[PDB]
Amino acid sequence: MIDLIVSQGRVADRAAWMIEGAARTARALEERYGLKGHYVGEPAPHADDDWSVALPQARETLVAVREAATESIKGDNLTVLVNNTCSVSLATLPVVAREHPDAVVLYIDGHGDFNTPETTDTGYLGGMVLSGACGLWDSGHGAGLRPEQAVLVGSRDIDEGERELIRKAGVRVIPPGEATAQAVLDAVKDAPVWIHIDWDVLEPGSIPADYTVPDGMLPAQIRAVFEAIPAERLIGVELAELNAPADSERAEQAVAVILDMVAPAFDAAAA
Ligand SMILES: [Mg+2]
Ligand SMILES: [Mn+2]
Ligand SMILES: [Mn+2]
Prior knowledge:
Mn(2+) 1 binds at residues 109, 113, 198. Strand 4 (104-108), helix 5 (129-133) and strand 5 form a beta-alpha-beta unit.
């Protein structure tokens, strides 16, 4: 079975429509799979605040997501989190690492999200998520994910300083052109798997651009990963950072593509 948890509280959001994009994604999954999501948190406007301000503002939402994710992970369902921002995972990844200390996290993102308070150029909490879960800095929500068990998938054009933090910590990076389903399967070895996706991993627009080599990952590559992870080894999936307004045609088209990508894994868990 699938347990759907949806964040609707601000967690450092700097984009206007990621809370709405999460809501629309959750609605599409509810309709397709016959689920009702557990919605957590109260919306608030986006702002360009420092992580040191945004993080305590998000405490209530993050604690409530932690509690819901803990309950889902303790059972025997596929835990699906539809999150406004990657920063929600500061609460979920420590739970995953505690409950499944052998799990590999596939952190699928166009960015590394591996900055610390000392290295961030923008102050953005969302750029500090994977490093916080791995304990390079203290988010107040725990850590415990071993960097040797974290794999960045689809990341590219990483700042040279952040890239060396990643390398020093032992986090592997599989860029889009190397991120075939088999390359990802080979990186997880015999471990159970947690998948975290930031949609900025995807190549922008043009749908299939037949004569251009993409810089990002294509939807078919994401779908292939979901097809390749065995259902009995998939712990959970987080879907984050769809910036699409409510009631827009854009959100309708985006969620259709999302449903296509996740279907292999979600269909198997529903069955
Ligand atoms: Mg390789
Ligand atoms: Mn991200
Ligand atoms: Mn990103």
